[PDB]
Amino acid sequence: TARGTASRFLTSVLHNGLGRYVQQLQRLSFSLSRDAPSSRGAREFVEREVTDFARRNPGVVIYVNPRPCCVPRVVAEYLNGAVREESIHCKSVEEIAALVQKLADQSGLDVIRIRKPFHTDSPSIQGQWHPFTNKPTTLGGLRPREVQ
């Protein structure tokens, strides 16, 4: 519900993508277990694709922590200072790779209702409409019933 939740405009951090593109994902901290049956997906992702993902994206710091935990989690911290914690509890390696790619592709801004699907700075090129932009001027600037 728009009236129940918050809202924001379509914005980008540091005007990203204008001069150069900077990956907004800063670090990815996986917390898993070696004996928990739920951490199977996290374990197999660590064995298989964490190295390939790290090589593909060198701008993100990847931490992996095995610990006696029951709910495997992933903490993505972005350049905005935003921290998004997701649960990778009982998910296959394909799903974990999809979630990691989504986190990498995200910009770190809040997932709330964007008021407008668009954002331009200074859309008033060539002028902006005002009531006087289409009315002809009269000789001497006289009022309709003013006599000079």
């Binding site: 008021r115 954002h119 700075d121 932009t133 002809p136 001027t137 009269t138 000789l139 001497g140 600037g141």
Partner: protein
């Protein structure tokens, strides 16, 4: 010299079609307001509170103006001055004053 719309307001539109026929061009330079269609700026400068005896008191004679009215007359004066109704100027309760957004989003 032909134009569907008059060139008297803000721009001079000239339409044309590319010889290929797949593109329409329109040259429309802005129209400036000529000097004969303007009037000079009125300037009103009058200080009737100046006194030859004490200009120190004369200066405060133009600043000591104050007035206070009741709620009804004040709202009536505001409505008459801004051409609105009298129901807009009445205050609101705590329920509506608490639910206002402290940091509304801003564009541009």
């Amino acid at each position: 010299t032909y134009s569907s719309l008059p060139d008297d307001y803000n721009c001079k539109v000239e339409l044309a079609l590319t010889s290929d026929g797949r593109t329409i061009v329109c040259y429309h330079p802005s129209v400036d307001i000529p000097y004969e269609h303007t009037k000079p700026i009125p300037r009103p400068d009058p200080v009737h509170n100046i006194e030859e005896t004490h200009d120190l008191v004369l200066k405060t004679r133009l600043e000591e103006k104050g007035e206070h009215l009741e709620q009804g007359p004040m709202i009536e004066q505001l409505s008459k001055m801004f051409f609105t109704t009298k129901h807009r100027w009445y205050p609101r309760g705590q329920y509506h004053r608490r639910r206002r957004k402290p940091n509304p989003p801003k564009d541009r």
